[PDB]
Amino acid sequence: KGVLMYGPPGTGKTLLARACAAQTKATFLKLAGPQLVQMFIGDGAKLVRDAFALAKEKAPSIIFIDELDAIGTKRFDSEKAGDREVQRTMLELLNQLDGFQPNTQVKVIAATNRVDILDPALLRSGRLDRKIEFPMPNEEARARIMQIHSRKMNVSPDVNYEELARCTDDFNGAQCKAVCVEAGMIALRRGATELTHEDYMEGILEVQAKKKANLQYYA
Amino acid sequence: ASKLPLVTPHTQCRLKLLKLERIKDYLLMEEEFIRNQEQMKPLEEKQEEERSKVDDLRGTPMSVGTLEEIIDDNHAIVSTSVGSEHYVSILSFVDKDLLEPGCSVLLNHKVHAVIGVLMDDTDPLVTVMKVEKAPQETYADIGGLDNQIQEIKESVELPLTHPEYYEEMGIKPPKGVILYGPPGTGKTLLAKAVANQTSATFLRVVGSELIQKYLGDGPKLVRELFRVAEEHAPSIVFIDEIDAIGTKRYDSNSGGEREIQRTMLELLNQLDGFDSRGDVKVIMATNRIETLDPALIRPGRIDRKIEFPLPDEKTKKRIFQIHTSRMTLADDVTLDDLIMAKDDLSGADIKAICTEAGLMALRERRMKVTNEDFKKSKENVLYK
Amino acid sequence: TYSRQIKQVEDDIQQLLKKINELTGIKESDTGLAPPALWDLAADKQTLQSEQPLQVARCTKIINADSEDPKYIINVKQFAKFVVDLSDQVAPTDIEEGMRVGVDRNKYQIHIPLPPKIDPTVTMMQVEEKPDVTYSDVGGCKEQIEKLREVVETPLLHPERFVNLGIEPPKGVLLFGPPGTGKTLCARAVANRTDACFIRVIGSELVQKYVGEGARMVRELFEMARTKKACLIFFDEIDAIGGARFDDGAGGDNEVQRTMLELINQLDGFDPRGNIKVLMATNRPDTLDPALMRPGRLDRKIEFSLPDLEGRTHIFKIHARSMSVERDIRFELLARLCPNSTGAEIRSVCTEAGMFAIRARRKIATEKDFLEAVNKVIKSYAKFSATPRYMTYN
Ligand SMILES: Nc1ncnc2c1ncn2[C@@H]1O[C@H](COP(=O)(O)OP(=O)(O)OP(=O)(O)O)[C@@H](O)[C@H]1O
Ligand SMILES: Nc1ncnc2c1ncn2[C@@H]1O[C@H](COP(=O)(O)OP(=O)(O)OP(=O)(O)O)[C@@H](O)[C@H]1O
Ligand SMILES: Nc1ncnc2c1ncn2[C@@H]1O[C@H](COP(=O)(O)OP(=O)(O)O)[C@@H](O)[C@H]1O
Ligand SMILES: [Mg+2]
Ligand SMILES: [Mg+2]
Ligand SMILES: [Mg+2]
């Protein structure tokens, strides 16, 4: 009961949620991070118990949370100042999630990128069970992502995805997605229809976004 | 009422004769097209009858409502004073225009239909931040500087009074004016003579009173401030002591320096926004010119940078002559001994010594001020 | 000869203007009335026709319907909640749930649906109006104009070159450099050229007093943005709306970060903005959060540096074309004297250099007047200069 995904924010975290949302034929229910943040008091908390009442009603149903750190900030003892109202809704998220009167009808899918902000009370063992990270692609998945996003484009067979994924290190699925669209734009700049190797190679330099400053005086 | 803007001529010209006799054509011909109305169909008076027909449409319980939207086919959603809004219709004596979202209107008592609009009693803040009258004397009160007076007249007064010199040049005036130096050097005192000189609407704000206690009320006060500055006409906005937003921290502000920062972002917008700015000149003054953000001091946001040095001794004697003009000066005194008393005395020091010396004369009920009044006056003012 | 005779024939007919315009009726300076000739539509017919048959039809908000029956659940501003019904004039199709409807005061039944709330502070930041800045006025950064303009308007003005090739164009771009470099002025050419909704946003306008108040303004922003076909959303000074998350010990600067995360969620994931293009412009990019800096939100990454020599000379030709000059001056000598200078500084050199001609008694400035501008603007204001801790963006 309760899975958590965390890692760099470009490794693909919304993508699995929209994947399984297409897979299972259940009552999919999504949430925004600061959606449980209200001006008046108690409204976000009632918004928690109403949503989990509805997911209680739909017995096949799973709940998603995107960007939990908007509400899941670790508490702090402070006089003279300090918010409390977010920690109200966070505490009913704790108790209403797990504790008094539990159930096994819903499954929780939580998505964040940063962990150290989080209150460990939701990080206990049973509120959020399976904490998985999404690392950066090694080389082969970098070839695979651009192979996926290179589908609907006119690709001449001058490509070498193993060469491309090796000359492109330190990228994610978003940047490897961006190489495909910028390489797809350079060919329209030169009026070409198919895609060649140098369109990708020039797309690399735009995705990397280097500062141009007059350097040919090496070597 | 805006009948004919041709008021050029300025002598005994026949054009003036024939044009005023052709206004006599539109008025004699058509005063004979004013006679016939109540002669043919009286049927009412139309001066009050149709007017009291409107006034018998609209009831005496005129509820005051508030606009929030407009649908063009004379019905809209208007706000009640309670908060429970309606979907009433709009009349034909409502002159469909002075209607903006947020405007105070006049509704029916029965069906709450949009009867009339209401003139707005504005807000007191405009009268608070708006200088009404001329403060004091002219630039001849200042004395000794004589260089940057041409600079402030250059950037402010001359664009206003002579809109020919920039057009024969094909050029626009510089935008921002900043004033900096030691304290008490007459930085505000120059703006006094500017507020004497100009005919434009003048606003003045201290840089200390920008800061607030609530969140965003600072930048909101900036936005409505430049709103008030633009919504008049040619205007001059003066900012005094803008280092104080960055120097002193107060515990009334809930946000820390990263709320002051965001206020500086909003003001940094309001100097050089992409919007059409208008005829709003900006004059600023401080003494800690080195502390604040150089992003606000760049050309484009502030164009003219004006330093005020300390007064040299030959200008000092002029300032003594200024502040000792209308007083009964006994011949006991020598002002040259009073010049080198402090090596870096400000212009405020001179006036303080003069006024306190007059206080020493009024302790002894005399009419003239003697030398020992100055001798113990510099001890009282300077040395403590 | 007819000295008084032209004056009194002037004044009696200018007065007789008033002596009959008071007999017309424009007078009785009101408290919010129409001119008395303007209103005569509602004179006899609509006085008893737009008032006496006409209702009030107080508007409400629908909670939900139910199956098999109309049996609607209504909601109002403060009062209670009713089970209500349609009229015969409308179908039950567009009486969908969560919708404002006009409702009579006695039977309490639905007449006509209403458009939703826009929260008119979000309405005011639609530009409604265009500036006059031409791309010719942004000379010196032509390749940045091209690399921006290929993203901003080319799918909007031509949605066939990208679709028929089979690519989806990027939607996001940030513009960044030193101040005074032509970023805001560069966006003014975009608001000049384009045609769709240009909704401007300055990052210091979303700082609110309550908790989570600004994040709902992001929501209403993108809700009215998704109603339109295509839209361009402008972002200015986004360091105010977020640098990063750094919270340690006591919670400081939390409130802005929730609005920033809301802006992230409204940008990517879960059936995205579709045809909504965004355009940021900041001063220092190093403060910015990497999840905001992820492509798919901020694809194009345009730097605005200083011109090398020739862009500067072109800027001299921009700001110096419309001023009375000596003919045989050269601008390249002036550009050799400004190694590191922005276009606003060049404009200040020009606008001061004309003031030198206004100093004594000259209608057209000279080359030595320009030299009097260079040492004052460049080398005498050189204490401030505003640039060097912004070249490193710190
Ligand atoms: N050059 C001067 N000649 C005559 N009087 C002066 C001069 N400079 C200052 N004074 C007098 O001293 C007083 C204070 O001057 P002013 O308010 O301009 O100082 P300031 O530099 O503006 O201080 P701050 O800007 O820190 O408030 C004025 O009332 C003015 O009469
Ligand atoms: N390349 C250029 N050519 C001509 N004028 C320029 C150029 N770059 C900047 N300017 C001048 O700079 C002024 C302001 O530019 P802008 O407001 O875009 O600065 P910015 O780069 O947005 O920095 P900031 O965000 O601090 O304003 C304009 O009035 C314009 O005349
Ligand atoms: N197999 C993949 N690996 C990595 N990235 C991918 C993959 N497939 C698609 N992507 C891209 O990465 C993004 C995944 O979103 P995600 O990283 O969850 O956003 P964030 O975590 O910043 O909210 C998508 O926008 C998509 O374009
Ligand atoms: Mg996500
Ligand atoms: Mg002063
Ligand atoms: Mg700018």
Swiss-Prot record, chain A:
Cellular component, GO, one term: nucleus
Gene Ontology molecular-function annotations: ATP binding; ATP hydrolysis activity; identical protein binding; proteasome-activating activity
Keyword flag Plastid: no
Modified residues (Phosphoserine): S156
Binding site for ATP: G7, P8, P9, G10, T11, G12, K13, T14
Location relative to the cell: Cytoplasm; Nucleus
Keyword list, A-Z: Acetylation, ATP-binding, Cataract, Cytoplasm, Deafness, Host-virus interaction, Intellectual disability, Neuropathy, Nucleotide-binding, Nucleus, Phosphoprotein, Proteasome, Ubl conjugation
Keyword Ion transport belongs to the record: no
GO biological process terms, semicolon-separated: blastocyst development; modulation by host of viral transcription; positive regulation of proteasomal protein catabolic process; positive regulation of transcription by RNA polymerase II; proteasome-mediated ubiquitin-dependent protein catabolic process
UniProt PTM comment: Sumoylated by UBE2I in response to MEKK1-mediated stimuli.
Disease: Deafness, cataract, impaired intellectual development, and polyneuropathy: An autosomal recessive disease characterized by early onset of deafness, cataract, severe developmental delay, and severely impaired intellectual development. Patients later develop polyneuropathy of the lower extremities, associated with depigmentation of the hair in that area.
Role summary: Component of the 26S proteasome, a multiprotein complex involved in the ATP-dependent degradation of ubiquitinated proteins. This complex plays a key role in the maintenance of protein homeostasis by removing misfolded or damaged proteins, which could impair cellular functions, and by removing proteins whose functions are no longer required. Therefore, the proteasome participates in numerous cellular processes, including cell cycle progression, apoptosis, or DNA damage repair.
Family named by the database record: Belongs to the AAA ATPase family.
Name of the molecule in the record: 26S proteasome regulatory subunit 6A
Organism name: Homo sapiens
Gene label: PSMC3
Curated annotation (Swiss-Prot), chain B:
Residues that bear Phosphothreonine: T8
Residues annotated with N6-acetyllysine modification: K213
UniProt cross-link Glycyl lysine isopeptide (Lys-Gly) (interchain with G-Cter in ubiquitin), position: K192
Domain of life: Eukaryota
Subcellular location: Cytoplasm; Nucleus; Membrane
One biological process term in Gene Ontology: proteasome-mediated ubiquitin-dependent protein catabolic process
Matches recorded under PROSITE patterns: AAA
Binding site for ATP: G181, P182, P183, G184, T185, G186, K187, T188
Keywords for this protein: Acetylation, ATP-binding, Cytoplasm, Deafness, Intellectual disability, Isopeptide bond, Lipoprotein, Membrane, Myristate, Nucleotide-binding, Nucleus, Phosphoprotein, Proteasome, Ubl conjugation
Region (Disordered): 39-59
Any Pfam family: Prot_ATP_ID_OB_C
Record field: compositional bias (Basic and acidic residues): 41-58
Cited SMART domains: AAA
GO cellular component, one term: nucleus
Membrane topology: Lipid-anchor
UniProt keyword annotation of Signal present: no
GO molecular function: ATP binding; ATP hydrolysis activity; proteasome-activating activity; RNA binding
Subunit structure: Component of the 19S proteasome regulatory particle complex. The 26S proteasome consists of a 20S core particle (CP) and two 19S regulatory subunits (RP). The regulatory particle is made of a lid composed of 9 subunits, a base containing 6 ATPases including PSMC1 and few additional components. Interacts with SCA7. Interacts with NGLY1. Interacts with PAAF1.
Described function: Component of the 26S proteasome, a multiprotein complex involved in the ATP-dependent degradation of ubiquitinated proteins. This complex plays a key role in the maintenance of protein homeostasis by removing misfolded or damaged proteins, which could impair cellular functions, and by removing proteins whose functions are no longer required. Therefore, the proteasome participates in numerous cellular processes, including cell cycle progression, apoptosis, or DNA damage repair.
Noted disease: Birk-Aharoni syndrome: An autosomal recessive disorder characterized by failure to thrive, severe developmental delay, intellectual disability, spastic tetraplegia with central hypotonia, chorea, hearing loss, micropenis and undescended testes, as well as mild elevation of liver enzymes.
Family membership: Belongs to the AAA ATPase family.
From Swiss-Prot, chain C:
Keyword entries, A-Z: Acetylation, ATP-binding, Cytoplasm, Nucleotide-binding, Phosphoprotein, Proteasome, Ubl conjugation
PTM notes: Monoubiquitinated by RNF181. Phosphorylated. Dephosphorylated by UBLCP1 which impairs PSMC2 ATPase activity and disrupts 26S proteasome assembly.
PROSITE patterns, A to Z: AAA
N6-acetyllysine carried by residues: K77, K383
Transmembrane regions: none
Localisation: Cytoplasm
Example GO molecular function: proteasome-activating activity
Record InterPro entries: 26S_Proteasome_ATPase, AAA+_ATPase, AAA_lid_3, ATPase_AAA_core, ATPase_AAA_CS, NA-bd_OB-fold, P-loop_NTPase, PRS7-like_OB
Amino acids binding ATP: G177, P178, P179, G180, T181, G182, K183, T184
GO CC annotations, alphabetized: cytoplasm; cytoplasmic ribonucleoprotein granule; cytosol; extracellular region; ficolin-1-rich granule lumen; membrane; nucleoplasm; nucleus
GO biological process: osteoblast differentiation; positive regulation of proteasomal protein catabolic process; proteasome-mediated ubiquitin-dependent protein catabolic process; ubiquitin-dependent protein catabolic process
Induction and repression of expression: Expression is not cell cycle-dependent and occurs throughout the cell cycle.
Pfam families documented for this protein: AAA, AAA_lid_3, PRS7_OB
Subunit structure of this chain's protein: Component of the 19S proteasome regulatory particle complex. The 26S proteasome consists of a 20S core particle (CP) and two 19S regulatory subunits (RP). The regulatory particle is made of a lid composed of 9 subunits, a base containing 6 ATPases including PSMC2 and few additional components. Interacts with NDC80/HEC; this interaction is detected only during M phase. Interacts and SQSTM1. Interacts with PAAF1. Directly interacts with TRIM5. (Microbial infection) Interacts with HIV-1 Tat.
Family listed: Belongs to the AAA ATPase family.
Protein name: 26S proteasome regulatory subunit 7
Phylogenetic placement of the source organism: Eukaryota, Metazoa, Chordata, Craniata, Vertebrata
